[PDB]
Amino acid sequence: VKPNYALKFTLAGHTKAVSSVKFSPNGEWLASSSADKLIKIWGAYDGKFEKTISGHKLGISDVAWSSDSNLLVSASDDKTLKIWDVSSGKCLKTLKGHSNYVFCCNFNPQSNLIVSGSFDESVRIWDVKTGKCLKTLPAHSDPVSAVHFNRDGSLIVSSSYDGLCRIWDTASGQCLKTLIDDDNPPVSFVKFSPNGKYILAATLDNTLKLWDYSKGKCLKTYTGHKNEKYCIFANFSVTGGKWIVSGSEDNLVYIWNLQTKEIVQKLQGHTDVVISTACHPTENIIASAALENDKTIKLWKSDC
Amino acid sequence: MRTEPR
């Protein structure tokens, strides 16, 4: 079985490279962040532009949704995160304390916490209600490229250019596992599988790997794409067939069979590096977005 | 920025 993703919409409006797209948990919305300092909200099914959210003083590298789809958090080169009320567009809180660019962010499932990663080599855990920093983890010895909570929020996984993935106990901030592999290539992305048992990690040697968190073992590797320079988002697709989805520096979206590791589809149409992909929570829909020469977001639909 | 190469 192979998917048949086809282009449905191209969404234009960002005036610089797009950095990150994410579907709302309720499936209604796509949020996008950009080097142009803006967040934009779009209808997930009709592609209709809904609104622009502004206030950061420099570009935004990441954005993430609360579980109830009512809040957004953004990570910016202005060294802050911001918490936004989506319906009003207002900045509820500015999270201050990182000493360099904030690169990555995520809510926990309860959505009382935010985790952030920075070029300052730290991971920070923040209280949503007060905006205070609860914990600073001395997580890595190089920029932190990704941070993600597991399905109940008890664990954080982080990745770094230092070549490590680390698993942290949320409650205590203590490191539970370090993933190392061979020649330590920079790790550009990491995230938990939906069941929380596996971790998907990208390295800047054109490689994706699936790790069993319990065992410390690599189970699958995925290759054929181009990834040497950028921190590109990758995904588990679970609404139909079980795929791995990733952007690529050859301007394509790559889709693999998770079990067999065979490439099952490449989505053509972007005209610059595909820096971000996202998988819709219930429909077989992919959102992709590209860098400077393109600046658009594409929505794609498949029967499986 | 994520939009700049390493």
From Swiss-Prot, chain A:
Report the main location listed first in the record.
nucleus
Q: Which residues carry this modification: N6-acetyllysine?
A: 82
What outcome is documented for mutating residue 61 to F in this protein? Strongly reduced affinity for histone H3
Gene3D superfamilies cross-referenced by the UniProt entry: YVTN repeat-like/Quinoprotein amine dehydrogenase (2.130.10.10)
Q: Name one GO biological process term.
A: negative regulation of transcription by RNA polymerase II
Q: What is the effect of changing residue 233 to W?
A: Strongly reduced affinity for histone H3
Which consequence is recorded for altering residue 291 to A? Abolishes histone H3 binding
Outcome of substituting residue 119 to A: Significant decrease in interaction with KMT2A
Superkingdom, natural source: Eukaryota
Q: Where is this site: Important for interaction with histone H3?
A: 77, 103, 233, 292
**Pfam families given for it?**
Beta-prop_WDR5
Q: Impact of altering residue 103 to A? A: Strongly reduced affinity for histone H3. Significant decrease in interaction with KMT2A
Q: How does it assemble?
A: Interacts with PAXBP1; the interaction is direct and links a WDR5-containing histone methyltransferase complex to PAX7 and PAX3. Interacts with HCFC1. Component of the ATAC complex, a complex with histone acetyltransferase activity on histones H3 and H4. Component of the SET1 complex, at least composed of the catalytic subunit (SETD1A or SETD1B), WDR5, WDR82, RBBP5, ASH2L/ASH2, CXXC1/CFP1, HCFC1 and DPY30. Core component of several methyltransferase-containing complexes including MLL1/MLL, MLL2/3 (also named ASCOM complex) and MLL4/WBP7. (Microbial infection) Interacts with herpes virus 8/HHV-8 protein LANA1; this interaction regulates the MLL1 histone methyltransferase activity on viral DNA.
Job of this protein? Contributes to histone modification. May position the N-terminus of histone H3 for efficient trimethylation at 'Lys-4'. As part of the MLL1/MLL complex it is involved in methylation and dimethylation at 'Lys-4' of histone H3. H3 'Lys-4' methylation represents a specific tag for epigenetic transcriptional activation. As part of the NSL complex it may be involved in acetylation of nucleosomal histone H4 on several lysine residues. May regulate osteoblasts differentiation.
Family, according to the entry, reads as follows: Belongs to the WD repeat WDR5/wds family.
Query: What PANTHER family does its record include?
Result: WD REPEAT-CONTAINING PROTEIN 5, WD40 REPEAT PROTEIN
Q: What is this protein called?
A: WD repeat-containing protein 5
